[PDB]
Each structure stands twice: as C-alpha cells, then as structure tokens.
Amino acid sequence: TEKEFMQHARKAGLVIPPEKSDRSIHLACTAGIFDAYVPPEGDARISSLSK
Amino acid sequence: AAPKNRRTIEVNRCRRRNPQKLIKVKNNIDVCPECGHLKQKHVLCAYCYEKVCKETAEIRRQIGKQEGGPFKAPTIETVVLYTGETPSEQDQGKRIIERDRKRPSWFT
Amino acid sequence: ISHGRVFRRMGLGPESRIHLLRNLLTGLVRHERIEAPWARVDEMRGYAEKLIDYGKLGDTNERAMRMADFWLTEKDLIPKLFQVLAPRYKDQTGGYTRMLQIPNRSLDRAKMAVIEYKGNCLPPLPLPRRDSHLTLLNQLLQGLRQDLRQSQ
Amino acid sequence: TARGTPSRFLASVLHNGLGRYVQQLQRLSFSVSRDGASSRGAREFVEREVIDFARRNPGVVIYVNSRPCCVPRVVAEYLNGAVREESIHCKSVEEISTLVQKLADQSGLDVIRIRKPFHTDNPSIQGQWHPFTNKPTTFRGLRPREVQ
Amino acid sequence: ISRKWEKKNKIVYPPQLPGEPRRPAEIYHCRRQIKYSKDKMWYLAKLIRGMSIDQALAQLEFNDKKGAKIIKEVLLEAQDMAVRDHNVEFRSNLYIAESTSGRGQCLKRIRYHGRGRFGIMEKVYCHYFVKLVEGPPPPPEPPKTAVAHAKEYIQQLRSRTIVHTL
Amino acid sequence: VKKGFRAAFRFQKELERQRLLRCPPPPVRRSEKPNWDYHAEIQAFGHRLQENFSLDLLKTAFVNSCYIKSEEAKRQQLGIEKEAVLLNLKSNQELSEQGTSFSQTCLTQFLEDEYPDMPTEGIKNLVDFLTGEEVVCHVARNLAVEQLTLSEEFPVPPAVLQQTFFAVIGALLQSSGPERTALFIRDFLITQMTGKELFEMWKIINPMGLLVEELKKRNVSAPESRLTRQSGGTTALPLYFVGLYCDKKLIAEGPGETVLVAEEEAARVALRKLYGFTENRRPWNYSKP
Amino acid sequence: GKSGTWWDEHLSEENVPFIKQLVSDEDKAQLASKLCPLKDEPWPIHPWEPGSFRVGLIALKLGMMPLWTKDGQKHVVTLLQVQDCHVLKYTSKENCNGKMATLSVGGKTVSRFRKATSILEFYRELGLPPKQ
Amino acid sequence: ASQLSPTELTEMRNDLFNKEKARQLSLTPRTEKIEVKHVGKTDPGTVFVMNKNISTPYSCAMHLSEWYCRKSILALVDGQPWDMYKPLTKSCEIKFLTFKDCDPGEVNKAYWRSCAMMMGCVIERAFKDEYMVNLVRAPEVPVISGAFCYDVVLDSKLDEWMPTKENLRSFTKDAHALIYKDLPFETLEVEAKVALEIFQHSKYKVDFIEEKASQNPERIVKLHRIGDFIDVSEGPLIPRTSICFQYEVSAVHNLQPTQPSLIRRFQGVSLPVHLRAHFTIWDKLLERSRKMVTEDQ
Numbered sequence A: 001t002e003k004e005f006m007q008h009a010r011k012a013g014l015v016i017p018p019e020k021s022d023r024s025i026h027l028a029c030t031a032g033i034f035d036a037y038v039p040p041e042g043d044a045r046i047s048s049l050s051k
Numbered sequence B: 001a002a003p004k005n006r007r008t009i010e011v012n013r014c015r016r017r018n019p020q021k022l023i024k025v026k027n028n029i030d031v032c033p034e035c036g037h038l039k040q041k042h043v044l045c046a047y048c049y050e051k052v053c054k055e056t057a058e059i060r061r062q063i064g065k066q067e068g069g070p071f072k073a074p075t076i077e078t079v080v081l082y083t084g085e086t087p088s089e090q091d092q093g094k095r096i097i098e099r100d101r102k103r104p105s106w107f108t
Numbered sequence C: 001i002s003h004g005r006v007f008r009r010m011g012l013g014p015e016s017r018i019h020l021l022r023n024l025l026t027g028l029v030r031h032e033r034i035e036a037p038w039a040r041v042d043e044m045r046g047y048a049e050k051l052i053d054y055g056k057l058g059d060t061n062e063r064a065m066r067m068a069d070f071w072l073t074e075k076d077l078i079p080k081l082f083q084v085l086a087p088r089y090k091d092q093t094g095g096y097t098r099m100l101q102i103p104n105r106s107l108d109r110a111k112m113a114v115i116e117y118k119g120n121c122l123p124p125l126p127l128p129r130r131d132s133h134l135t136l137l138n139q140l141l142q143g144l145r146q147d148l149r150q151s152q
Numbered sequence D: 001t002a003r004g005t006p007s008r009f010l011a012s013v014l015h016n017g018l019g020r021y022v023q024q025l026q027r028l029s030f031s032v033s034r035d036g037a038s039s040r041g042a043r044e045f046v047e048r049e050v051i052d053f054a055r056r057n058p059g060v061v062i063y064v065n066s067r068p069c070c071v072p073r074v075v076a077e078y079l080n081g082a083v084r085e086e087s088i089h090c091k092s093v094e095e096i097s098t099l100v101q102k103l104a105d106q107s108g109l110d111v112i113r114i115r116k117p118f119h120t121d122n123p124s125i126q127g128q129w130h131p132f133t134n135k136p137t138t139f140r141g142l143r144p145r146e147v148q
Numbered sequence E: 001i002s003r004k005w006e007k008k009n010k011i012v013y014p015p016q017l018p019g020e021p022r023r024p025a026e027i028y029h030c031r032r033q034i035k036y037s038k039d040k041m042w043y044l045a046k047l048i049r050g051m052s053i054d055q056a057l058a059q060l061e062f063n064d065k066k067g068a069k070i071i072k073e074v075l076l077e078a079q080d081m082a083v084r085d086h087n088v089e090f091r092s093n094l095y096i097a098e099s100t101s102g103r104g105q106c107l108k109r110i111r112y113h114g115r116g117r118f119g120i121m122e123k124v125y126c127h128y129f130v131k132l133v134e135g136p137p138p139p140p141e142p143p144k145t146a147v148a149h150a151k152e153y154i155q156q157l158r159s160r161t162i163v164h165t166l
Numbered sequence F: 001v002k003k004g005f006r007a008a009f010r011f012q013k014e015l016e017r018q019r020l021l022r023c024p025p026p027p028v029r030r031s032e033k034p035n036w037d038y039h040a041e042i043q044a045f046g047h048r049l050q051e052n053f054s055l056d057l058l059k060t061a062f063v064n065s066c067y068i069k070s071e072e073a074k075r076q077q078l079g080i081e082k083e084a085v086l087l088n089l090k091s092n093q094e095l096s097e098q099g100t101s102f103s104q105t106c107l108t109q110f111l112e113d114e115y116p117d118m119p120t121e122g123i124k125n126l127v128d129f130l131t132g133e134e135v136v137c138h139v140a141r142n143l144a145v146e147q148l149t150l151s152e153e154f155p156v157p158p159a160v161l162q163q164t165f166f167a168v169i170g171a172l173l174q175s176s177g178p179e180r181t182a183l184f185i186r187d188f189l190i191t192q193m194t195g196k197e198l199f200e201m202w203k204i205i206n207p208m209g210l211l212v213e214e215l216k217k218r219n220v221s222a223p224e225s226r227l228t229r230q231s232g233g234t235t236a237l238p239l240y241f242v243g244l245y246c247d248k249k250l251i252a253e254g255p256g257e258t259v260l261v262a263e264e265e266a267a268r269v270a271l272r273k274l275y276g277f278t279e280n281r282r283p284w285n286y287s288k289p
Numbered sequence G: 001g002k003s004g005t006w007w008d009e010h011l012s013e014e015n016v017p018f019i020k021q022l023v024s025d026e027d028k029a030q031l032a033s034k035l036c037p038l039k040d041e042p043w044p045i046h047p048w049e050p051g052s053f054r055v056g057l058i059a060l061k062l063g064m065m066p067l068w069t070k071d072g073q074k075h076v077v078t079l080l081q082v083q084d085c086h087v088l089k090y091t092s093k094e095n096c097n098g099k100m101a102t103l104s105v106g107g108k109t110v111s112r113f114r115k116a117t118s119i120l121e122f123y124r125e126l127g128l129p130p131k132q
Numbered sequence H: 001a002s003q004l005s006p007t008e009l010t011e012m013r014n015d016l017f018n019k020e021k022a023r024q025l026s027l028t029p030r031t032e033k034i035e036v037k038h039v040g041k042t043d044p045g046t047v048f049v050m051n052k053n054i055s056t057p058y059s060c061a062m063h064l065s066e067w068y069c070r071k072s073i074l075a076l077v078d079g080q081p082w083d084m085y086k087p088l089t090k091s092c093e094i095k096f097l098t099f100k101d102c103d104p105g106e107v108n109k110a111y112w113r114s115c116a117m118m119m120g121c122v123i124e125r126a127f128k129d130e131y132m133v134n135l136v137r138a139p140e141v142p143v144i145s146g147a148f149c150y151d152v153v154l155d156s157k158l159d160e161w162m163p164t165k166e167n168l169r170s171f172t173k174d175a176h177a178l179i180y181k182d183l184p185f186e187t188l189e190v191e192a193k194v195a196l197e198i199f200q201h202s203k204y205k206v207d208f209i210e211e212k213a214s215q216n217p218e219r220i221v222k223l224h225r226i227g228d229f230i231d232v233s234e235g236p237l238i239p240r241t242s243i244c245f246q247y248e249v250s251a252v253h254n255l256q257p258t259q260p261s262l263i264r265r266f267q268g269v270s271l272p273v274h275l276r277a278h279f280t281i282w283d284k285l286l287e288r289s290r291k292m293v294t295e296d297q
C-alpha cells in the first residue's frame, strides 16, 4: 500500500548537443536567402519578350 | 447485518440509472442583458457581480488608506469621485474618495 | 414537528447563533455590503432592520444605546449608526436591507447572497430590472389600459 | 442445442427433381503433400480413385494443388455459393472416398436444425380450415337473439 | 494503457464526389487521468449525451459538481479544435454525439481501521471521452402513440401460422 | 512465456478469423481466386445441365459488349495491340435476342395451351413475370452463369445477368433444336411458378371491373354482392365473407377484415376461378412424351 | 425547449398594478353578479319529503371559543366561517353510479394566475372566480 | 388578366419567384468576401468574414452562439432593419435586436407585418373556390391598437353574410397548422417591372405595387414568401413562423361607405414565444381585439 506513478516526461526538444560534444550537426541547407531578388514593378506589364 | 448474495450488474444498473438518480435538465438559463455572459434567473450575473466587487475592492482600499488605522469609521456620509469630476455643492460635508480612473459607464 | 417555528438553528446553540448574527451585523454596519450564505443573511437581515429602528429612536435614549452597545462589537459603529445610518432613513419606514442571490460559493457549494443598506456610496449591484414598457405585451396592455380609461 | 444454433426450413435449392436433376456440386479443390506422412491416404487417393471419381459425375471440376502442407484439405463448392472445407488429415483411402462421395451427394444448404421435415407448397386442396367451415347458415343470415 | 481515442482524429477520408451528401465533420477529444470517480463523472456524461454544444455548456456552467468544470474545459477546447483544425465553419453548429467515462489507473493506500486492522483505500481516477458531430442536434425519438401500438398488434396477429403441421 | 508453437499458431489463426469477420473484404470474382480454369468450367457447365452445347457458341454467349469495350479501353490506356482475338469476340447480343424471342414465344405457347381460358393480357403479364429481371437473375445466379460471365463491376448488375442468361438460352437454341430448348426453359422457368398465386404475378388494380367485363363477355348478367358470414362488426378485428351471386347462384366467396376488402377478395376469387387458375388446378405435367 | 413562465414575468413596471386592479375588479364584479339567484332563472324548488338529503357547504375554520348554557356548563365551539361558497356543477342520477345524484360545491376564492388551464376554462364558462 | 385555376396561379407565381431568385444568385460570379463588423453590446469588436450575397445575418449569428440564433429577431445593418434571412451586400456593421430589448418598436412592427401576412395566407386558401378572394393590403396600424388587420374583397355573392365563431376557430386552427410547421420567411428585393409581371391579375395588388415603387427612385419593392404564398409588404419580417405562439383571428368588420363594393377587414391578435401571456391576460387581449381598429391617417 505504498506505490506511486511513473513517467515524468517533457515534450519540447532543446540544445543538448552543444552542452558538450565533439560532433556537430551536419546541415544540408541554410536558414533564409542571401539578398532577395526584387522583381521589376511592371513584370506583368512587360510580360512580353522585351521593351 | 451482512449481504447474503452479490448484487449483479443487472440489478445495479436498474438501481443506479433510473430517472430519480439522473441529473435533471434545468432551463432557468438565459443571456444577461448587459455583457451576454449567461446568468441564471433569480441570480445575479457572476460577470457583472465580479465587475462590481473589483471596483468595490479598490474603493475599500482607498478608504482604508484614508482612515489610517482601525476604529476610525467617520460620522459623515462618504462619496467617491473619479478623475475630473469636481465635488458637487450637495456633497459638501461628505467624505471625498478619489482613486484614479474614468468613471465607468454603469456607476452614475 | 416545527409548525410555526421561526428562527433557524445556526451555530452550536442559541448563544452561538446570536454571536454569529452579531458578527455578520457588525460587518454590515462597517462595510455596508456583505456576502455570506443565504440562511445567515436572512436571519441577520431580520435583525438589521430593527437595529435601524433602535438607531432611529434617538441618541439620548438609554435603551437604544444599550442595544447598540450590545449588537455593535467595534464601538465606533455606534456614532456611525446614530449619526449617519439613522439620519439617512429619516423619511423611510421599512424599505432597506436589499438582499439578492449571488451564484454559489466555490468550495462547498453553498447558497450565497448579498445584503446592503440603501444609500450606500459603493457602486450599485447589477439589479434585475422589470421589463420595459415598449415591448409587445406591455404595448398591448397599454392599449387596453388606455381603452378602458377612455371608456370610463 | 437447438436454442443456441440457427435453424432453417426444409427446402430444395432450385426445385431439383421437378424438371431435370442437376448435380449441386461445382468443385473439389485438393491440397496434398509430396513428402509428409499426414497426406498418405490422400496421396493414394490421388493415385487410384480421383480419376474414376472425375469420370463418374462429370459436373464437378477437380483440382489437385500438390502443395507443402501439414494438414491436407478438400474444399467443396456448391452451386448456391457455399464453400465447405474439410480436412483429410491422416485418413484411409476408404475414408477419403466416403468423404468425397458424401460431399458429392449433398447440396449446399446449411447443416443446421432442419425444422419440420416436409415442405408442402400447397398444403390444402379441399380448402383450409376457418371457423365457418362445418357451420350451417340460417335464413337471411340472422344472428342469435335477432328480431328481423 | 491504450490510447486510440486520440488517434481517431487522424483518419483522412477520400475526396467526395460532387453527386454526394456533405459527410458532417467528426471530432474526438478526451482528457486522461482526471482525479474524479468514474460513476460521478458518468452521471454528467449521461446528462450531456444528446444535447447541442451551447446547451451543454449552459447546463454545465450551472451544475455544481467537480466534474462540470472539467467537462466544460474539454468541450470548449474541442469546439476550438473543431473550428480551427478539422474545418468546421460555425462554432455553434456542433452536437455531442458520444459522451462517456472510463476507469483510469488507480493507486492504493491503507485506511487504518480501529484495532490492528486495515482496509485498502483506493485513489480513484477516470477519463472523459467526447465526440462532436457538426449539424443540428437530432430530434428526440417521439413516444409511440396508440396508432403505432395498434398497428404493431395487428401485424403480430397477421404474422401467426398453424404450427406443428404442414 | 510458455514454451511451444502450436497454441500460438492456433491463436494466430483465430485472430485472423476474428479480424476477417470484423472487416470483411469486398468480394472478388471466382475468376480471380486461385482454383479456376475457364475451359473446364464451361465444359462442366455444359455437362451438369445434361446438355450438349457447341462450346464456341457458349464461349460466344458468355462475353459481353461492356466487357469488350472495357478490355479495349484497358489495352488502349496501356497501348498494347490486342487486335488479334478481340476483333473476333462477337458479343452476345444476337444470341440474347434469339434467346429472348424463342423463350417468349415458347412460354407463350405453353401458357396458352395449359390455360386456354386465361386472357392475352394475363399471359403477357405472366411471360413478363417469368422472363422478368428478378427471377431470371435468381435462376442465373443459382445455376452459376454469374461466375462465368465476363463483365466489369463484379456483382454483375441484373440487366447484364438477364442478358447473358437469355444468351445461353440462345446458344442452346443454336446447338440443339427447338424441342431441347423448350424442355430447358420448361424445367428452369416454369417451375418458378410453383407455389405462387395468380395475382402475385399479374398484379391487377381493379379486380371488380375486370370481373364485370369478363362476365360481360360470357353473357352472365352482373354479379351482385351479398353478405354471407360475419363475426363481430363493432370490434377492431372483424371477419367478413362476401359472396358474389349471378342470377341467385354463387360464383365465389372471399374473406376480409372489412366489407370492401372482402368484396375485392371475392372479386379476386371469381377472377381466378374464371381463368382456370385455382390452387386446385392440375400441377404441371413434367414428363416426356 | 420552452422555458417556464409565470403571470408577471414579461409585464412592465406600470402594468402590474393595473393587471392586479383589473382582475380584482373583475372577480369582485363576478362575485357580486351572482348575489340574487332567485331573480335569475331558478331551478324548481320542492318541499321536504322524509327520504331527502340536501347539500352542504365548505367553511374555513377560524378558531375556538368557550360558550355557556343556562344550566352553567361550559362548552367549546369552533367558529367555521362560510367565506365564498358556490354550487359549481350538477351530475344526475344515471350519470355517476345509478344510486344518488351529486352536486359539486366550491370553496374560498383564489387567484386565476395559479390554476390549470382547464379549471380556468371551467370557471370562465361558469362565470365565477376559481375556488380552492 | 385571364382565366386561371387558383393552383396554377400559385405555380406560375412561385416559379417566377424562383427564377428571379436564381438570377439574383447567379448574377454574382464567385465568392466575394465582406467584413461585417459587430457594433453591438455583448461581444464587441468581433468581425466576421462573410460571403457576399450568400451569407445571411443568421449565418453571422451562428458563428457566435446558439442564443444569438434563438433570441435575435431583426438585424440592424448600419441604420436600417434587415430581416434575418436576407443576404448582405456591402461591408457593413451589424447589431441584433431582441423582443425584450430597451426600444423594441421596430421589431414590433416587423412582427405584426409577419402576423398580418400569415393571416392573409390563411384567409386566401380557406374559402370556396367558386367564390373569388382578392387580397387588397395590410395597412400599417400601430401596435398600441389591439389587433393586426388585413383587407380583403369577398365575392359579389357574399355582400350579406358574416362568419360565426366556428369559421373563425377554423381560421385559427389553420393558422396554427401554418405555425406548427416551422417555415422560413424568405425575402427577395425585385424591380417594379418583374414584380408587376408576377401578379398581373389583382388590380389592388397592382396599385399597391405602384404606390410602393413610386416612393423609391430605383422602383424596387419588397416581396416575401412563406412556402407557396407570395405577398407585398413594406419593411422587413421575422425569420421563422414558429416564433408566434398564441395566435387568434378575432373578428371581421365591413367598411362600406367609401366605396361601392364591400371590403372586409379581418382582425386578430398574436404574441411571440418569448413574450407569451397567462391565459387570463390573453383572454383580456383577445376580448379587446374584436373592436374595430381604424388607424390609417
């Protein structure tokens, strides 16, 4: 008549691999873009061959 | 005295599930005319009562600031003021409690 | 068998009942609005009205002063009763101590209520108003009232 | 027990003996083992008797699968759609011949309680009993204690 | 432990053909391991079972039980997930289809009776399941009138045969 | 754990049985299940009916126009040239038309020479009942032409099943003379009339008007209905008996729960007795001359 | 579903005293209308036969009181007051049990706002305020 | 103007009504979004995103709660009462009106328009078909008078009779048959040309349509429908016909001397389900409504 529950868990991943290691995570992309291509304002207006 | 036999689940379901033991549907319930937060008839709305008790609590805190310590309890009527709101001439001798707010549009 | 038997049994006796009502009444005279369970404010409302009657009997009356000295347990509420509460109801006869139901206590699910003295510099209670005169049924009854007024 | 199992009425499948009798068996699907002692009687059945059985009543198509199995079986399919699968696990040649003959004889209806073993489809000829059979009529159809 | 009522929201049906009815939305939600007995929770679940969701919230806001606030929380968040995730467009247009309670994992304690004797006190837990279906609440089954009673009795008398003969 | 293999395997087979009984699969043709050979099935279909079909005409009769178009649609969505055998399939339309024409005229001749008093409209409704969709699909399903029929949409929608059943009637008409096909449609269609009343097949609406028209032909004047037997008029479960008298002579008598339904049933009884179709008639003489 | 209701739920602040005054005046006039039954159209009055049984009343028990007689003894009486008594309906001899005819008699007046609809229809057809 | 049975007239009328409603729905091509705002009291700052010319204000009350569906009778689109089943057009701000509100005068007028229209619907299908019934109009009387009124010319054969209580109770029982089936008051705002093309026979309806079309510059009159009845009215209606709970036609009265022929004014009283009265007060109100209402000037 002396027994308790189990399973204390958490549901959010975190940043353990820099807490100490010598293997870093091998990415295959980047976050965003380098410098955004600003299109011309009349791109549908000049949607033909050229001008 | 002790049971002579185990009551089955059929007899138990006949007992603990009849309309004398079920929860009765009530139909006293409608929307409050102000604030629409579903009061009961013959009962003050808990939202509007919470409004009034919060404002009454702040007024009582300002009274407790103005009365200093206990056993003070003045021999004059009190009256509350909000920002702006100069004291009327009929509220001359009456105690003036001013907190800081606009006067709410239910307390007139 | 309790036929015609008023005065609920509240505390642990008669004397504890008088002390419970005395504490509720002293809180009412100080703060002018109280929330408590419904039976207790019912009994205390029946006592509060006659306390206002004793306060309105006057200040130099020794019997009224004795009653205010017993029932008010903080002794500053006696000048308040004889100089604020009783002059406030100098015109009225018996309509004060307005009592209304508030929903339920959180823990033990009791029937609670609010009583207040009238006058009452506090913000007003959300009173339920009787229905307006411009509605359908009341305009029909107003037409009937005007018709039997013109018929007379 | 009969209250615990279903029951049907005695019936023919499509009025067999009225016009022409038709063999109510469609198929026999045999699955016997090459190696394995459990299929020895069925192995000898495929040796000697299934050829004469196939020649005997040609309405039935017989298949022998010859599959590795610890329990050989026979699946008998009937015309009305029913499928009856029986195991011929460790049986004689005579027992398997009796089994396939009994499967060849019967029809595909359920073997449950068969419930009143006769199926007259027009049971009465002189006219079924109603309470005004064996009762005399009276003049102008008067009831008892009538006046006119 | 088996958690399948949580996985019922992950069913995805094929896209419907234009010559078909609507197939109303179905939303399952449950709250596990409530510290409340399963019988007392069952009485509230039987109270709700057929009502609309706004009427269920109205009855549960004024019922003075411990499980009433719990079921009101579950029904409110099921309404929120129904409008947000499962693409119900009207917040009010949902009715409770299934409403029940199950046993949860319990603990055991001693009760210390009044000699050197004891019992096994059990710390009770329960679940609450709910299933919402969009659409108006279905009308209650009307009680059978004397016409239907008479029609069933005459059908019974027309059904009988001459037994134990041809 | 308990050691062993056989009880675990037996519980596995029971688990598959329960799980297959919970979610049953959509049923597949017998052509797609493992034990199946088409030529042996056509030969056994010829043999169990005690008939001698020419197998090319039966294989002609079992294909369908929808099956031809669907097979060419399957070979054209994949683009494979199957113009070898598909151009010579010869769908069962003409055999079904021959079968319907012969079955209609032979059933008309049987029903005319068995009941010479039945009207033309009644024999037309009877041959519409026997060649109707439901009973030819029932006989077709319990004689296993459904398993041999080539089509799409596996349950074989009943127009296609009726068409292929009359197609195999036409194939029997091609391979053997009119007498053998007459015996075939006798034994497999007229036996469906057993145990059924007349107006369960004709389904007339106004029997009294048809009865007074019939008596207008036979020069019997007009049937007057007189009430014969009754037991309880005031209650909710009456019983009546209305007899139809022609010149003070009984011709029929019918029971019922009201007077009107007893009169209508009496009209039905007279209308059966006039047409030579009573439940006491000579049963059909299945024999060989 | 339909909620409950009472008589003065939807009435205004000004219409409640008007409805009280109106219905009080109406049933006061209805009680005063039946005051002279012998001038309306009375049923035929008969003389007393020895095998006869007449109607009774419905009274309201006020209280008790002592009461003395000429020999000196003291008796106690109960004061029963007949407040508002009216014969309501008559059922003939063949219509109840075949034994004796019955008369219905009503008690003191109560409010129309607290009776069932069929009872109010009965008193509206009869012309009296409803009885307790 | 031609000979027509009374049923093929309602067939062609409601078929033309459905054709005009289908054209009204089909004129808009796609799903356009409008941002209707809530400028009410209870749930302020709420802003719906609705489908233009499809979504009703009932479909805006369904987003909030069920009580907004139960108790709201009229919408208030920016200054003007909108009946609860009329498709919104422009991006607006909305507010709902109830019977127990502070100033319910507009919804009272809407309720009495709907009850008078129901009385016209129950009058026009209860007479003998060899007699002719011409529904003239329902004049907008104030609700302080005891009853709503509907104007009807009867047959020339019937300038002498008046109904007893049994015909009136037959009228109310048919009106309760109308009430028991919960029918939608469907509206449609049509041009004067199509509206005059609807009726074509009742010259009283023709002059009433011309009167209501003369006052607006676009010549648009308000048609409504309960099932297979179609009538003209000024202003909006209530959503459902089951909102009425206590209903009665009181009497009929003849007002001859303004005209050669005889016009008969049918009068009756009603009360909604949320504002029902006790049986005694209801019989009082029923008793007053037998007196003739004359408020037209």
Ligand SMILES: [Mg+2]
Pocket (backbone or CB within 6 Å): C010, C011
């Ligand atoms: Mg106690």
Ligand SMILES: [Mg+2]
Pocket (backbone or CB within 6 Å): E115, E116
């Ligand atoms: Mg010890």
Ligand SMILES: [Zn+2]
Pocket (backbone or CB within 6 Å): B032, B033, B034, B035, B036, B037, B038, B039, B045, B046, B047, B048
């Ligand atoms: Zn509120």
